[PDB]
Amino acid sequence: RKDRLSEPPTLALRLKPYKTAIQQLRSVIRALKENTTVTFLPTPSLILQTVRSHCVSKITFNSSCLYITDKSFQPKTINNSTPLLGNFMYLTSSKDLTKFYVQDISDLSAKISMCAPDFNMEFSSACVHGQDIVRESENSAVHVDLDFGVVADLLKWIGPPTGTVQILVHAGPPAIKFILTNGSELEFTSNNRVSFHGVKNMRINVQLKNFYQTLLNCAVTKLPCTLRIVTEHDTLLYVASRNGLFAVENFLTEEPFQRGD
């Protein structure tokens, strides 16, 4: 055309940070379940969400990975499981990826472009719905930060429904107790490696499989890990860990154990 320029809003991945994060995460990415969602936001942000039985898991890439040309970019959530490609996020963890951007060309779909040395491809996936808003905009009733050394001790101790783990929190003094069904309890009291910010005398029960998976997911950061028991409405357990590149968050509901039908 001859007037003034115009390119559709474009959400681009910055390769060096993104490639660093997707390698660190390549364990989690290949294991992503068939119903996993990818969301692109003009914030900018990129969110992987997996909704399970009693667990919602979320992986948020932060701005350091993203460049957005134009903030009128409309939000898009697509299925990670893609009709011919399969695991889309896995595709992006290829080593010879050179360009990776998303364009807002239709309100109905999302145009993904990817490049490699002497090759380029694009596809569009239908936008799914949505809006699958499930966020931690609610503050904790008990909040505990665990040094990573503690995360590994927990993992190592849970080895190994197919079981539940009880979590007990004391207030005076503060302590946190992990109670398996077999009569073994693992406890942490105040010390340089576990910080109790807010705390009250309470207990919830979660599924052991999910909590273990949850802990594995946070441990990719090899950084501290945040444990919250939100008492909003649904009794909730929040486990999360983050670095400069991304944030692993997990929302586990208590297994209904208080009467009961």
Add this chain to the structure above:
Amino acid sequence: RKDRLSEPPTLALRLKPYKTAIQQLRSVIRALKENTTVTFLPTPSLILQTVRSHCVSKITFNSSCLYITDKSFQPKTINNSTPLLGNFMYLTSSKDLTKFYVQDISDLSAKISMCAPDFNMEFSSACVHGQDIVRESENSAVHVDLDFGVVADLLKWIGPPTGTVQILVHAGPPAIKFILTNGSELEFTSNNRVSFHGVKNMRINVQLKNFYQTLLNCAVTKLPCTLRIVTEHDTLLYVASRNGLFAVENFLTEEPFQRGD
């Protein structure tokens, strides 16, 4: 535009025949070696070629699979191994494939479009060279057709360099002898299941691994199989089998066994 219509030359797959052939071939397709080539011809034709040590293997899809809009479509050969997708022909054997065509838009590349229910993608790969012409436009000095029952007997008998098999052909009367290094020979004389069209008293030696692989490849047709010993220049063994959808051809050179440096 406002004048007369114009669409770039397009080589399209007819799904029902193509999907039938790619399923019948899904064993061979996934095993395709990293250096496998795909060629698109305005004939129309589609050719998969693999060049090995002493073996060139070729899979030709015939017209019943292809529709060509415009015969000015330029020939294109690309790598099957694709920078982000990996095995391209494997990708096309997906069950929810709904459209598969190739367009001549650049003399330098090939634009592949593929569709699935609510999804579509395209990519271009650089045209490689070429021209990798290796064809059977030379007639046999010995030519033997084997009933499929014979192909399976051969396969079953070769169980199981890492060995060679000698192939001996008699002329008066005609017979064909397969001689392993261990002193076991398998012979076929004239009967309703092996037809000797042209024949002379000669022997060549080929690598056992390749010949066995070659036989496996022809056997996907469960139809007769053509055995030729071309005496052009390079002493050559040709093994092939075809159906209405495609043609498996194999060119094996004799292992230099006649002095010798």
